Design a protein around this nucleic acid. Structure first.
Lengths: 83, 185, 136, 88, 84
RNA sequence: GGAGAGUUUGAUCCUGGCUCAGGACGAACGCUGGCGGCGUGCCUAAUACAUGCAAGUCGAGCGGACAGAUGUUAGCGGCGGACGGGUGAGUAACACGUGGGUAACCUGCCUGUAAGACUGGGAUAACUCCGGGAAACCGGGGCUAAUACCGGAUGGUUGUUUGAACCGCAUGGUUCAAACAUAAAAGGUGGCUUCGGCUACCACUUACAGAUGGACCCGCGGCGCAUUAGCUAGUUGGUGAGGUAACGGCUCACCAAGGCGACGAUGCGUAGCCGACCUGAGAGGGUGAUCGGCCACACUGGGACUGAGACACGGCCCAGACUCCUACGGGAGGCAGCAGUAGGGAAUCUUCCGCAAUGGACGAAAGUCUGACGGAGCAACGCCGCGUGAGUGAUGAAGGUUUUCGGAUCGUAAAGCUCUGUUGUUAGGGAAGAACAAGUGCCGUUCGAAUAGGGCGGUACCUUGACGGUACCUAACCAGAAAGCCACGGCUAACUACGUGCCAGCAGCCGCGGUAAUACGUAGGUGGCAAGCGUUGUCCGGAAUUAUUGGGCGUAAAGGGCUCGCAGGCGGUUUCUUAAGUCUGAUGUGAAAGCCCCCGGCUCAACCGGGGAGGGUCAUUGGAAACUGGG
């Protein structure tokens, strides 16, 4: 069916886009984790302002759920305040 | 189907006049063919069925429907059977026999509250006015051709089912208990 | 039994096995197994056709066939009516019905269905013998 | 969305409808939330009977009447009652 | 309006061997369908007890909760009668 | 509201089993066959599938094309394709039913209430060119728009932190306040313009409601097998972390040794479950076709993507088997959608018409799509209705059959005479099912700065039927075209003759058949039904025949060889008390359809519709307290 074929093309192309966003959010999250492991606040606290960006970015584009973010934020922010 | 066969041998087998006159039983009041509890029950069912001229399947269901009413099952079963339009036509005297009354109805000569009913087995209700249609007002068989539950007017050729019979009006040859027995098997 | 004894070990209804158990299988070629499907007739191939002696005190030559059904069961059937056209390799239709006096015969061949011909010059009970109404 | 629509009952050449509140994805003659009334277009004139208290309950929840239902509501004066309630 | 209520069950403890976890039993009389005699039925329940208050024998109250593990859907409320 | 009968004997009573009369079918088979209305129609191979069709739409998001103002649509984008439709394989499971819970949840579209919609950027299909494929296609270069995508602006979101200020079922919940960090969005069409813009509508963003749908957990209920007794090691719990929309061995590490089971675990076998349906006096048994709910599944096994929702019937990816293509290199496909085919089978339909109606998708709408659905076709497959004649008519004709040849019967049956036209044939006439939507006006109201022109509600006008010239109706003509099937010893309604002579045959049972056969075959008649009637299969009844209602155990089958006993079952008397049983009230719920009841519509009925009733080992919350159970 025509409309299936178009959906398949798009589904592949929305996917690759989506991995860009996931990856860039996994970057921001892991940076905070290594920053809090180093026990450096300034790095960690700035990385959490970025992680929040990349996390809520995904929540804008449906790729993360309100709830799945609010977890990730809390988890990370607890480490930054654990400094 | 309907039975179109000889009317007399039925009377003769049952040992009652089904016409009500006596004439089937004038010359030979004995069973057809060269030999002239279940039996008696069956005899009585076949009595009442053959009289009014309905086929068993419709008769067994007219009995099931009468059971639902309040009173004696046999009594109420005779009452509906009497309400049938072919019978009411025959009782009002618009026809000489029930088989004529059927054909009157079936071919659409009859009216019930002014409107054509071409169904013998129509179950006529109190208040309803049986009449002849205007095309058939001068039928020979009607001109040629009454109980208290009915009322007729031979000028206008239109009757009325004023009340339900009550059982003393209906055929006293019939032991309806036997038929209620017949079906309880 | 006491109520408590019934609570513990209840009443057990009997088993009521089929009068016609070759009608009550099927056969799945692909799975190579018996189905459990009741049928009102079956088809089968006559592997032998002959006559049997009834059990005493009856005496005649009773016309039978030895049929292998579609479900792969092999059953003796009775051949009713006067005179028949069944040879080996006839395709027949069997119904239910034991013949009382023939030990082994739990099925009747249907007359007038498949290769089994109707009974000739029958005029009463024709339908039971697979015979068309003579005049017109 | 929740709709108000006609469910086909009756028999082959004699349709009769019940006005049911139903989610859109439900099958026509299947699952429904509430019956609101009955439309018999075959009789002359078409016999319509509607239980306002529900009809309005469901208009104000934002169930949308199908085109015919809309017009059935109009003729009983529901659509007026609905419009006047949003103002007053 | 007020909250809706969880199920409450008064039962007897039949294990304390698990950490923070009692196995309560509730014994009720289910009619037999056919006969009409009432029969003793036992239903075990795992419940969560944080301070290990309840011990084997005790008549405890429990209340239903969200799942607290694979099997625990109850918390210990009270210990109505202690063991002997 | 409940019917019996036959059969162990020389005869008998009892015990006991068997057999039959009834009712049902998604039935089949045989014989027969007119019509109409309303239903039903692969139960087997969840076998394999030819061909066509079943999911698209939007140009009022967007460039580019191609036609000639305007129309058309490869492509991008939005939404739909997770519905509707099919099947019942798997599943003995919180799958399902019923009742609860979530303070452990998610929810596009719709409705309402508010706030908003600021300012930038770089791309990329289409196109055009080029390279490699046999094809499927695919790989390069350069262009281009978006209501596509990505930056910042501002937000009442969410984090985290600090307050207060109440409350619950532990975990906690709600409402407010502050700080800090993170978070949005879009235009398109018409009008009016002062040309800047402004306005309506549709769209867009966020929050909170509402509705709707979904998720999870729990009580309780509905199979067989002990010739299945042990089963488990992420198993059971804990502690953390991870993960999920969400709780949770869900996952992992570590620690502990747990967990389940004779109330039947575990295994094996069988099964989708339910409303219902069939049978029955009921209790109960059986079924789970059609219709409605829920679940599961989509060649088979496995995984994920996109999305509000899928681990996706007509989507991806992997693996396998199979079929098709082929330039052998690789490609393509999955009727358990509607038709249809082959195969299997006793056996089950047209490769139909229309979107007019009712739904659904998309659209501002016109529309477009719709094998949903509405209709039509085929089949006596079922249910209901009407026919195939009616009145009169001895002469009791002929003919047939029987015959103590007198007569009897077929038989008022026939003819004759008089009628009718249901139907049939033919010719006229001819519906309802239709509401609309849209467009047009007019009125009210609402937005608006613009009496512009939109929204919303009134009112008018207008115009669309597949069925279908079909139903129905009127007129004319003709008893003309329209009765079979089974049985007839008893059970069981209805009997004689001839032929046959333990043979041919019949049969459910008792049995029948070797010269008087009411039982075989035929004929006449009779009987029971009737467009059907028989036969077979299957289920329930008859079967107080697994017995709770409702049976028994001296001798008919049936008292453990006997103890001691664990569990279990059962428990003297009085009084107090509780109230788990028990009785009773109220509330909530037990969908619709069905069944039953009362009405109403089809000429009647079947069927259809409206109102009601019923139905729980039900939840919740009050009463009573004798009895049973606590104390």
């Amino acid at each position: 069916i025509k409309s299936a074929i178009k959906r398949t093309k798009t589904n592949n192309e929305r996917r690759v886009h989506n991995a860009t966003i996931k990856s860039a959010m996994r970057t921001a999250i892991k940076q905070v984790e290594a920053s809090v492991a180093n026990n450096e606040a300034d790095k960690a606290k700035t990385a959490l302002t970025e992680a929040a960006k990349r996390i809520d970015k995904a929540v804008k584009t449906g790729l993360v759920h309100k709830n799945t973010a609010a977890r990730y934020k809390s988890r990370l922010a607890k480490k930054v305040n654990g400094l | 189907a309907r039975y179109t066969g000889p009317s007399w041998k039925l009377s003769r087998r049952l040992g009652i006049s089904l016409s009500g006159t006596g004439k089937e039983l004038e010359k030979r009041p004995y069973a057809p063919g060269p030999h002239g509890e279940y039996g008696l029950q069956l005899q009585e069912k076949q009595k009442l069925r053959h009289m009014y001229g309905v086929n068993e399947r419709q008769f067994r269901t007219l009995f099931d429907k009468a059971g639902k009413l309040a009173g004696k099952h046999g009594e109420n079963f005779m009452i509906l059977l009497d309400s049938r339009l072919d019978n009411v036509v025959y009782k009002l005297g618009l026809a000489r026999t029930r088989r004529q009354a059927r054909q009157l109805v079936n071919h659409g000569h009859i009216l019930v509250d002014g409107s054509r009913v071409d169904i013998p087995s129509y179950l006529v209700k109190p208040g309803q006015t049986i009449g002849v249609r205007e095309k058939s007002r001068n039928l020979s068989i009607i001109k040629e051709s009454v109980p208290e539950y009915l009322t007729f007017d031979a000028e206008k050729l239109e009757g009325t089912f004023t009340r339900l019979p009550e059982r003393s009006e209906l055929a006293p040859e019939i032991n309806e208990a036997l038929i209620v027995e017949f079906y309880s098997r | 039994p006491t109520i408590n004894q019934l609570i513990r070990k209840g009443r057990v209804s009997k088993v009521e096995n089929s009068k016609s158990p070759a009608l009550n299988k099927g056969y799945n070629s692909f799975k190579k197994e018996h189905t459990n499907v009741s049928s009102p007739q079956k088809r089968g191939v006559c592997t032998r056709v002959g006559t049997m002696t009834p059990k005493k005190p009856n005496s005649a030559l009773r016309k039978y066939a030895r049929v292998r059904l579609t479900n792969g069961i092999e059953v003796t059937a009775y051949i009713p009516g006067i005179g028949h056209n069944l040879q080996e390799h006839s395709v027949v239709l069997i119904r239910g019905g034991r013949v009382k006096d023939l030990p082994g015969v739990r099925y009747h061949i249907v007359r007038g269905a498949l290769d089994t011909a109707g009974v000739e010059n029958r005029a009463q009970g024709r339908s039971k013998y697979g015979t068309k109404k003579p005049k017109a | 969305a929740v709709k108000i629509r006609l469910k086909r009952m009756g028999a082959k050449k004699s349709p009769f409808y019940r006005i049911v509140v139903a989610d859109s994805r439900s099958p026509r003659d299947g699952r429904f939330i509430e019956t609101v009334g009955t439309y018999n277009p075959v009789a002359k004139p078409a016999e319509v009977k509607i239980d306002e208290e529900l009809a309005l309950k469901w208009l104000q929840t934002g169930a949308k009447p199908s085109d015919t239902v809309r017009n059935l509501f109009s003729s009983q004066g529901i659509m007026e009652k609905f419009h006047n309630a949003k103002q007053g | 309006s007020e909250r809706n209520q969880r199920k409450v069950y008064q039962g007897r403890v039949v294990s304390d061997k698990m950490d923070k976890t009692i196995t309560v039993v509730v014994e009720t009389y289910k009619k037999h369908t056919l006969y009409g005699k009432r029969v003793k039925y036992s239903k075990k329940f795992k419940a969560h007890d944080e301070n290990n208050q309840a011990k084997i024998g005790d008549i405890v109250k429990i209340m239903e909760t969200r799942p607290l593990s694979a099997t625990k859907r109850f918390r210990l409320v009270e210990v109505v009668e202690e063991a002997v």
